[PDB]
Amino acid sequence: MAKISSPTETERCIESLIAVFQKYAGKDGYNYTLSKTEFLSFMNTELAAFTKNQKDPGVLDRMMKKLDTNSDGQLDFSEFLNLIGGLAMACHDSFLKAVPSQKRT
Amino acid sequence: MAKISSPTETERCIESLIAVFQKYAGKDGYNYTLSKTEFLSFMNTELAAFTKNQKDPGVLDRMMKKLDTNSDGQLDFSEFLNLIGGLAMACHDSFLKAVPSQKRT
């Protein structure tokens, strides 16, 4: 069985975001939107790498309100992904400042 | 060993995007930007789920020019992630039109 991965690395990444997003956003039960405290818990757990590396949880506050383009105080599908964009760009930048030659053969 | 995953599901998703992005974008060797043909190959391989489900590869053309905010004809870190946003939103929407109760305990 060569095709063990129905999704690819990006697609599975995407379904990962589905998993993590919908489990935390699914706590507030609004419109599958990641509420303030849900995102606080989210970022301190699922993004503790970033969150705890910052300095104080007030950053999650800055994240939320930056991404909260719906201006409801929650992060929807795209708002969470906007986040993922900045997150990815931070880790990418890490690689660019380290070794971005991730040319996996 | 409980902490076998240094990255979380979102963080690993993010490093996945690093992996897939930098391997294809690393083919053009510009500024780690996913060039037209590199993205064509990318989307037909890594996103064949979406690409082949559309109808014709001219869609990748539409993706590129939508995401090519750098207006160079390539997708950078954020432009690829803009893509990932629309991709994720499509798969999310799939779940929302199916079963978005991905409340993994």
Tab-separated table of N, CA, C and O in Angstrom, chain B:
chain	number	residue	atom	x	y	z
B	1	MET	N	7.015	8.221	28.067
B	1	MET	CA	7.181	9.516	27.372
B	1	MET	C	5.833	10.038	26.883
B	1	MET	O	5.267	9.536	25.911
B	2	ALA	N	5.311	11.038	27.577
B	2	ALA	CA	4.026	11.622	27.223
B	2	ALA	C	4.195	12.699	26.159
B	2	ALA	O	3.373	12.830	25.251
B	3	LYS	N	5.274	13.459	26.266
B	3	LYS	CA	5.534	14.556	25.349
B	3	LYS	C	6.357	14.067	24.158
B	3	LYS	O	7.531	14.414	24.003
B	4	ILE	N	5.737	13.248	23.321
B	4	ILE	CA	6.397	12.731	22.129
B	4	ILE	C	6.294	13.729	20.987
B	4	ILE	O	7.083	13.700	20.044
B	5	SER	N	5.315	14.611	21.079
B	5	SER	CA	5.109	15.628	20.070
B	5	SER	C	5.538	16.991	20.594
B	5	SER	O	4.802	17.644	21.337
B	6	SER	N	6.751	17.398	20.234
B	6	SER	CA	7.227	18.735	20.549
B	6	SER	C	6.288	19.791	19.946
B	6	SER	O	5.888	20.728	20.641
B	7	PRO	N	5.909	19.668	18.654
B	7	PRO	CA	4.862	20.500	18.070
B	7	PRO	C	3.484	19.904	18.316
B	7	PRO	O	3.337	18.688	18.468
B	8	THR	N	2.483	20.751	18.369
B	8	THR	CA	1.119	20.285	18.485
B	8	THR	C	0.550	20.039	17.103
B	8	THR	O	1.259	20.181	16.112
B	9	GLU	N	-0.722	19.711	17.027
B	9	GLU	CA	-1.350	19.400	15.751
B	9	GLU	C	-1.330	20.609	14.804
B	9	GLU	O	-1.163	20.456	13.593
B	10	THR	N	-1.454	21.807	15.355
B	10	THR	CA	-1.388	23.017	14.544
B	10	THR	C	0.053	23.361	14.226
B	10	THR	O	0.362	23.781	13.117
B	11	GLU	N	0.938	23.147	15.178
B	11	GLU	CA	2.335	23.477	14.976
B	11	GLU	C	2.963	22.532	13.968
B	11	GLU	O	3.729	22.951	13.104
B	12	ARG	N	2.605	21.262	14.060
B	12	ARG	CA	3.086	20.277	13.110
B	12	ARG	C	2.464	20.532	11.747
B	12	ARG	O	3.073	20.250	10.718
B	13	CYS	N	1.252	21.086	11.748
B	13	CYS	CA	0.590	21.479	10.511
B	13	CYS	C	1.416	22.554	9.843
B	13	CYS	O	1.632	22.560	8.631
B	14	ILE	N	1.900	23.438	10.681
B	14	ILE	CA	2.662	24.579	10.264
B	14	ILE	C	4.025	24.172	9.715
B	14	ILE	O	4.497	24.726	8.719
B	15	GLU	N	4.633	23.174	10.337
B	15	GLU	CA	5.930	22.697	9.908
B	15	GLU	C	5.754	21.823	8.686
B	15	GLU	O	6.678	21.636	7.894
B	16	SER	N	4.552	21.290	8.546
B	16	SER	CA	4.178	20.568	7.354
B	16	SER	C	4.164	21.514	6.171
B	16	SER	O	4.697	21.209	5.110
B	17	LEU	N	3.571	22.678	6.376
B	17	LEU	CA	3.544	23.707	5.355
B	17	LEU	C	4.953	24.159	5.041
B	17	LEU	O	5.268	24.459	3.905
B	18	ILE	N	5.797	24.203	6.060
B	18	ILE	CA	7.207	24.485	5.864
B	18	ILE	C	7.830	23.442	4.950
B	18	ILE	O	8.483	23.777	3.965
B	19	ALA	N	7.590	22.181	5.280
B	19	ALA	CA	8.131	21.066	4.524
B	19	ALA	C	7.687	21.109	3.067
B	19	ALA	O	8.517	21.115	2.161
B	20	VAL	N	6.379	21.159	2.848
B	20	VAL	CA	5.831	21.102	1.499
B	20	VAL	C	6.145	22.375	0.726
B	20	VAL	O	6.484	22.327	-0.462
B	21	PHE	N	6.055	23.508	1.406
B	21	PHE	CA	6.327	24.783	0.755
B	21	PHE	C	7.774	24.855	0.306
B	21	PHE	O	8.054	25.084	-0.861
B	22	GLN	N	8.682	24.616	1.232
B	22	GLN	CA	10.097	24.835	0.994
B	22	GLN	C	10.708	23.771	0.089
B	22	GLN	O	11.781	23.983	-0.474
B	23	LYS	N	10.043	22.632	-0.064
B	23	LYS	CA	10.540	21.615	-0.977
B	23	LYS	C	10.185	21.964	-2.427
B	23	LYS	O	10.987	21.748	-3.334
B	24	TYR	N	8.989	22.512	-2.647
B	24	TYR	CA	8.572	22.895	-3.996
B	24	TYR	C	9.059	24.291	-4.357
B	24	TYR	O	9.552	24.521	-5.459
B	25	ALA	N	8.923	25.222	-3.429
B	25	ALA	CA	9.407	26.578	-3.631
B	25	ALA	C	10.924	26.579	-3.722
B	25	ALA	O	11.531	27.446	-4.354
B	26	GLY	N	11.527	25.571	-3.101
B	26	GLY	CA	12.967	25.423	-3.130
B	26	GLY	C	13.464	24.861	-4.449
B	26	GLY	O	14.661	24.646	-4.623
B	27	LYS	N	12.546	24.603	-5.374
B	27	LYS	CA	12.916	24.122	-6.699
B	27	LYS	C	13.277	25.286	-7.610
B	27	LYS	O	14.150	25.167	-8.472
B	28	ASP	N	12.604	26.418	-7.417
B	28	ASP	CA	12.831	27.583	-8.263
B	28	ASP	C	14.048	28.365	-7.780
B	28	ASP	O	14.727	29.034	-8.556
B	29	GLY	N	14.328	28.237	-6.487
B	29	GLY	CA	15.544	28.789	-5.912
B	29	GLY	C	15.600	30.307	-5.910
B	29	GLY	O	16.676	30.883	-5.746
B	30	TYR	N	14.455	30.958	-6.087
B	30	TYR	CA	14.399	32.416	-6.082
B	30	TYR	C	14.595	32.958	-4.664
B	30	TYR	O	15.720	33.213	-4.241
B	31	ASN	N	13.500	33.114	-3.932
B	31	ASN	CA	13.546	33.569	-2.545
B	31	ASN	C	12.713	32.632	-1.694
B	31	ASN	O	12.012	33.066	-0.774
B	32	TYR	N	12.809	31.342	-2.004
B	32	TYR	CA	11.912	30.338	-1.445
B	32	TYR	C	10.467	30.732	-1.724
B	32	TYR	O	9.662	30.928	-0.816
B	33	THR	N	10.175	30.863	-3.006
B	33	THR	CA	8.859	31.234	-3.487
B	33	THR	C	8.394	30.174	-4.471
B	33	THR	O	9.180	29.677	-5.280
B	34	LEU	N	7.131	29.817	-4.389
B	34	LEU	CA	6.597	28.731	-5.181
B	34	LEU	C	6.191	29.244	-6.542
B	34	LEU	O	5.163	29.897	-6.701
B	35	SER	N	7.034	28.942	-7.514
B	35	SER	CA	6.876	29.444	-8.858
B	35	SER	C	5.688	28.791	-9.541
B	35	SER	O	5.138	27.816	-9.033
B	36	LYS	N	5.301	29.336	-10.689
B	36	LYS	CA	4.114	28.882	-11.396
B	36	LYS	C	4.137	27.373	-11.588
B	36	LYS	O	3.306	26.667	-11.032
B	37	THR	N	5.124	26.882	-12.322
B	37	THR	CA	5.211	25.464	-12.634
B	37	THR	C	5.430	24.619	-11.378
B	37	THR	O	4.951	23.485	-11.282
B	38	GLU	N	6.135	25.185	-10.410
B	38	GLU	CA	6.402	24.496	-9.154
B	38	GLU	C	5.105	24.328	-8.391
B	38	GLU	O	4.884	23.318	-7.726
B	39	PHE	N	4.239	25.321	-8.523
B	39	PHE	CA	2.952	25.325	-7.859
B	39	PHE	C	1.987	24.439	-8.618
B	39	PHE	O	1.116	23.805	-8.030
B	40	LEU	N	2.154	24.405	-9.929
B	40	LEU	CA	1.371	23.527	-10.775
B	40	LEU	C	1.632	22.084	-10.378
B	40	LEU	O	0.708	21.317	-10.110
B	41	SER	N	2.908	21.735	-10.320
B	41	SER	CA	3.325	20.417	-9.880
B	41	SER	C	2.871	20.181	-8.445
B	41	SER	O	2.334	19.123	-8.123
B	42	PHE	N	3.079	21.186	-7.596
B	42	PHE	CA	2.648	21.140	-6.203
B	42	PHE	C	1.176	20.808	-6.107
B	42	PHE	O	0.800	19.813	-5.518
B	43	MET	N	0.344	21.639	-6.690
B	43	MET	CA	-1.089	21.464	-6.560
B	43	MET	C	-1.582	20.171	-7.192
B	43	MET	O	-2.551	19.593	-6.723
B	44	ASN	N	-0.935	19.703	-8.246
B	44	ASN	CA	-1.359	18.450	-8.861
B	44	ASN	C	-0.891	17.243	-8.058
B	44	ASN	O	-1.375	16.133	-8.265
B	45	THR	N	0.062	17.448	-7.161
B	45	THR	CA	0.552	16.352	-6.326
B	45	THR	C	0.031	16.456	-4.903
B	45	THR	O	-0.717	15.602	-4.426
B	46	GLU	N	0.412	17.537	-4.259
B	46	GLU	CA	0.144	17.759	-2.859
B	46	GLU	C	-1.294	18.221	-2.644
B	46	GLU	O	-1.805	18.170	-1.539
B	47	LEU	N	-1.948	18.687	-3.695
B	47	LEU	CA	-3.329	19.127	-3.565
B	47	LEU	C	-4.187	18.560	-4.673
B	47	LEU	O	-5.174	19.169	-5.081
B	48	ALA	N	-3.792	17.400	-5.173
B	48	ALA	CA	-4.537	16.732	-6.222
B	48	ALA	C	-5.969	16.452	-5.784
B	48	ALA	O	-6.870	16.368	-6.613
B	49	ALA	N	-6.169	16.339	-4.475
B	49	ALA	CA	-7.500	16.175	-3.907
B	49	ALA	C	-8.408	17.319	-4.333
B	49	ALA	O	-9.567	17.110	-4.685
B	50	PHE	N	-7.860	18.522	-4.302
B	50	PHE	CA	-8.586	19.718	-4.694
B	50	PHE	C	-8.496	19.924	-6.203
B	50	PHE	O	-9.506	20.089	-6.887
B	51	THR	N	-7.271	19.889	-6.698
B	51	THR	CA	-6.965	20.179	-8.089
B	51	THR	C	-7.715	19.270	-9.058
B	51	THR	O	-8.334	19.741	-10.013
B	52	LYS	N	-7.668	17.970	-8.808
B	52	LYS	CA	-8.266	17.009	-9.724
B	52	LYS	C	-9.776	16.965	-9.536
B	52	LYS	O	-10.505	16.466	-10.390
B	53	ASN	N	-10.234	17.504	-8.415
B	53	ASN	CA	-11.654	17.520	-8.100
B	53	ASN	C	-12.323	18.743	-8.718
B	53	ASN	O	-13.548	18.833	-8.782
B	54	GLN	N	-11.507	19.687	-9.170
B	54	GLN	CA	-12.019	20.890	-9.803
B	54	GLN	C	-12.545	20.563	-11.200
B	54	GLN	O	-13.744	20.339	-11.372
B	55	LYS	N	-11.642	20.513	-12.181
B	55	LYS	CA	-11.995	20.145	-13.555
B	55	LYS	C	-10.782	20.252	-14.475
B	55	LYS	O	-10.491	19.335	-15.241
B	56	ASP	N	-10.073	21.368	-14.390
B	56	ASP	CA	-8.933	21.619	-15.261
B	56	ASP	C	-7.855	22.388	-14.503
B	56	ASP	O	-8.159	23.163	-13.598
B	57	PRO	N	-6.574	22.177	-14.870
B	57	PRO	CA	-5.415	22.788	-14.188
B	57	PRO	C	-5.368	24.305	-14.316
B	57	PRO	O	-4.519	24.957	-13.706
B	58	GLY	N	-6.282	24.864	-15.099
B	58	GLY	CA	-6.382	26.304	-15.209
B	58	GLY	C	-6.777	26.932	-13.892
B	58	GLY	O	-6.613	28.130	-13.688
B	59	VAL	N	-7.300	26.112	-12.993
B	59	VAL	CA	-7.636	26.567	-11.658
B	59	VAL	C	-6.389	26.964	-10.893
B	59	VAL	O	-6.390	27.962	-10.184
B	60	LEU	N	-5.320	26.197	-11.066
B	60	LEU	CA	-4.068	26.476	-10.375
B	60	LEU	C	-3.560	27.838	-10.809
B	60	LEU	O	-2.857	28.534	-10.078
B	61	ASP	N	-3.960	28.201	-12.015
B	61	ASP	CA	-3.619	29.489	-12.599
B	61	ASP	C	-4.355	30.593	-11.865
B	61	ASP	O	-3.810	31.664	-11.591
B	62	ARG	N	-5.597	30.297	-11.531
B	62	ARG	CA	-6.454	31.224	-10.819
B	62	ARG	C	-5.994	31.353	-9.375
B	62	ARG	O	-5.996	32.442	-8.806
B	63	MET	N	-5.589	30.226	-8.798
B	63	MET	CA	-5.064	30.206	-7.437
B	63	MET	C	-3.841	31.091	-7.372
B	63	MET	O	-3.798	32.051	-6.608
B	64	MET	N	-2.855	30.757	-8.207
B	64	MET	CA	-1.600	31.492	-8.270
B	64	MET	C	-1.837	32.992	-8.315
B	64	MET	O	-1.390	33.707	-7.443
B	65	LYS	N	-2.588	33.458	-9.300
B	65	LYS	CA	-2.735	34.896	-9.509
B	65	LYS	C	-3.573	35.557	-8.416
B	65	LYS	O	-3.471	36.764	-8.196
B	66	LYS	N	-4.401	34.775	-7.737
B	66	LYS	CA	-5.159	35.279	-6.598
B	66	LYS	C	-4.241	35.470	-5.397
B	66	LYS	O	-4.340	36.455	-4.663
B	67	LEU	N	-3.347	34.519	-5.219
B	67	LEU	CA	-2.478	34.474	-4.055
B	67	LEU	C	-1.214	35.282	-4.280
B	67	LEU	O	-0.639	35.807	-3.329
B	68	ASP	N	-0.784	35.332	-5.542
B	68	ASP	CA	0.394	36.090	-5.974
B	68	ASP	C	0.166	37.570	-5.729
B	68	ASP	O	-0.122	38.359	-6.629
B	69	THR	N	0.260	37.909	-4.475
B	69	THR	CA	0.072	39.253	-4.011
B	69	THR	C	1.373	40.026	-4.171
B	69	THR	O	1.392	41.257	-4.212
B	70	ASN	N	2.455	39.273	-4.298
B	70	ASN	CA	3.769	39.832	-4.553
B	70	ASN	C	3.879	40.223	-6.016
B	70	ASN	O	4.766	40.973	-6.426
B	71	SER	N	2.930	39.694	-6.782
B	71	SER	CA	2.768	40.005	-8.192
B	71	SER	C	4.025	39.685	-8.985
B	71	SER	O	4.416	40.426	-9.891
B	72	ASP	N	4.644	38.568	-8.646
B	72	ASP	CA	5.853	38.132	-9.321
B	72	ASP	C	5.569	36.866	-10.115
B	72	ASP	O	6.296	36.520	-11.047
B	73	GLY	N	4.479	36.202	-9.768
B	73	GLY	CA	4.124	34.968	-10.431
B	73	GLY	C	4.559	33.770	-9.622
B	73	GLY	O	4.723	32.668	-10.154
B	74	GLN	N	4.766	34.001	-8.335
B	74	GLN	CA	5.162	32.961	-7.409
B	74	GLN	C	4.431	33.178	-6.103
B	74	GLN	O	3.933	34.270	-5.845
B	75	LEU	N	4.381	32.152	-5.282
B	75	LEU	CA	3.733	32.263	-3.990
B	75	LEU	C	4.731	32.142	-2.873
B	75	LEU	O	5.372	31.107	-2.701
B	76	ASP	N	4.871	33.213	-2.133
B	76	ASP	CA	5.758	33.237	-0.997
B	76	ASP	C	5.109	32.591	0.200
B	76	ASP	O	3.978	32.113	0.137
B	77	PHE	N	5.871	32.563	1.264
B	77	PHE	CA	5.470	32.026	2.539
B	77	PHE	C	4.008	32.345	2.876
B	77	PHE	O	3.205	31.439	3.080
B	78	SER	N	3.667	33.626	2.899
B	78	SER	CA	2.318	34.060	3.238
B	78	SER	C	1.323	33.819	2.098
B	78	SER	O	0.150	33.559	2.347
B	79	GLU	N	1.786	33.890	0.856
B	79	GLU	CA	0.908	33.698	-0.293
B	79	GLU	C	0.473	32.240	-0.389
B	79	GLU	O	-0.676	31.939	-0.715
B	80	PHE	N	1.395	31.347	-0.073
B	80	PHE	CA	1.103	29.925	0.010
B	80	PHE	C	0.159	29.652	1.172
B	80	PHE	O	-0.682	28.761	1.115
B	81	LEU	N	0.304	30.426	2.228
B	81	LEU	CA	-0.525	30.255	3.405
B	81	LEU	C	-1.893	30.868	3.200
B	81	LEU	O	-2.875	30.416	3.781
B	82	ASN	N	-1.955	31.897	2.372
B	82	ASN	CA	-3.226	32.433	1.934
B	82	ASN	C	-4.006	31.334	1.243
B	82	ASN	O	-5.208	31.158	1.457
B	83	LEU	N	-3.287	30.607	0.405
B	83	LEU	CA	-3.794	29.416	-0.242
B	83	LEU	C	-4.312	28.422	0.779
B	83	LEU	O	-5.458	27.981	0.710
B	84	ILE	N	-3.438	28.066	1.710
B	84	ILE	CA	-3.764	27.136	2.774
B	84	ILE	C	-5.023	27.586	3.512
B	84	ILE	O	-5.824	26.764	3.949
B	85	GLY	N	-5.203	28.898	3.611
B	85	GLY	CA	-6.408	29.446	4.187
B	85	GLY	C	-7.641	29.053	3.400
B	85	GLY	O	-8.622	28.592	3.973
B	86	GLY	N	-7.574	29.187	2.078
B	86	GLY	CA	-8.724	28.887	1.247
B	86	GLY	C	-8.963	27.399	1.158
B	86	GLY	O	-10.103	26.937	1.109
B	87	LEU	N	-7.871	26.657	1.156
B	87	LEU	CA	-7.911	25.205	1.159
B	87	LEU	C	-8.566	24.703	2.431
B	87	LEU	O	-9.511	23.914	2.398
B	88	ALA	N	-8.056	25.181	3.556
B	88	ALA	CA	-8.567	24.792	4.854
B	88	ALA	C	-10.014	25.159	4.990
B	88	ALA	O	-10.794	24.418	5.566
B	89	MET	N	-10.363	26.317	4.469
B	89	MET	CA	-11.723	26.791	4.543
B	89	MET	C	-12.643	25.935	3.690
B	89	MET	O	-13.814	25.765	4.011
B	90	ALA	N	-12.098	25.374	2.622
B	90	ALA	CA	-12.858	24.491	1.757
B	90	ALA	C	-13.120	23.159	2.450
B	90	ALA	O	-14.234	22.632	2.405
B	91	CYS	N	-12.092	22.627	3.104
B	91	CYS	CA	-12.212	21.367	3.830
B	91	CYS	C	-13.035	21.569	5.101
B	91	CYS	O	-13.805	20.697	5.501
B	92	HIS	N	-12.876	22.731	5.728
B	92	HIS	CA	-13.706	23.105	6.867
B	92	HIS	C	-15.155	23.149	6.435
B	92	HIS	O	-16.009	22.529	7.048
B	93	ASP	N	-15.409	23.876	5.354
B	93	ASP	CA	-16.746	23.988	4.784
B	93	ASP	C	-17.315	22.611	4.463
B	93	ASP	O	-18.506	22.369	4.631
B	94	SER	N	-16.449	21.710	4.024
B	94	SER	CA	-16.836	20.333	3.769
B	94	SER	C	-17.375	19.703	5.045
B	94	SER	O	-18.434	19.080	5.049
B	95	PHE	N	-16.645	19.906	6.133
B	95	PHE	CA	-17.034	19.400	7.439
B	95	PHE	C	-18.293	20.088	7.936
B	95	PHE	O	-19.157	19.462	8.523
B	96	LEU	N	-18.398	21.373	7.688
B	96	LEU	CA	-19.559	22.138	8.111
B	96	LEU	C	-20.792	21.684	7.350
B	96	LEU	O	-21.913	21.771	7.843
B	97	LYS	N	-20.567	21.188	6.147
B	97	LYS	CA	-21.632	20.648	5.318
B	97	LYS	C	-21.741	19.134	5.508
B	97	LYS	O	-22.431	18.453	4.751
B	98	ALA	N	-21.056	18.611	6.520
B	98	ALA	CA	-21.050	17.176	6.779
B	98	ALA	C	-21.206	16.880	8.270
B	98	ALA	O	-22.270	16.458	8.727
B	99	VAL	N	-20.142	17.126	9.018
B	99	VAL	CA	-20.118	16.914	10.457
B	99	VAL	C	-18.932	17.668	11.074
B	99	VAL	O	-17.816	17.157	11.158
B	100	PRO	N	-19.154	18.918	11.494
B	100	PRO	CA	-18.099	19.767	12.026
B	100	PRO	C	-17.892	19.578	13.520
B	100	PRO	O	-17.114	20.296	14.148
B	101	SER	N	-18.575	18.597	14.080
B	101	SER	CA	-18.457	18.298	15.495
B	101	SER	C	-17.197	17.477	15.768
B	101	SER	O	-17.246	16.423	16.402
B	102	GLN	N	-16.065	17.980	15.284
B	102	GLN	CA	-14.770	17.341	15.491
B	102	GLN	C	-14.257	17.663	16.895
B	102	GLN	O	-13.159	18.190	17.077
B	103	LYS	N	-15.073	17.349	17.886
B	103	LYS	CA	-14.750	17.632	19.272
B	103	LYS	C	-14.005	16.456	19.884
B	103	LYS	O	-14.508	15.787	20.789
B	104	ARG	N	-12.809	16.202	19.366
B	104	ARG	CA	-11.983	15.098	19.834
B	104	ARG	C	-11.672	15.244	21.318
B	104	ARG	O	-11.059	16.226	21.745
B	105	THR	N	-12.121	14.274	22.094
B	105	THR	CA	-11.899	14.267	23.525
B	105	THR	C	-10.487	13.795	23.848
B	105	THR	O	-10.225	12.577	23.754
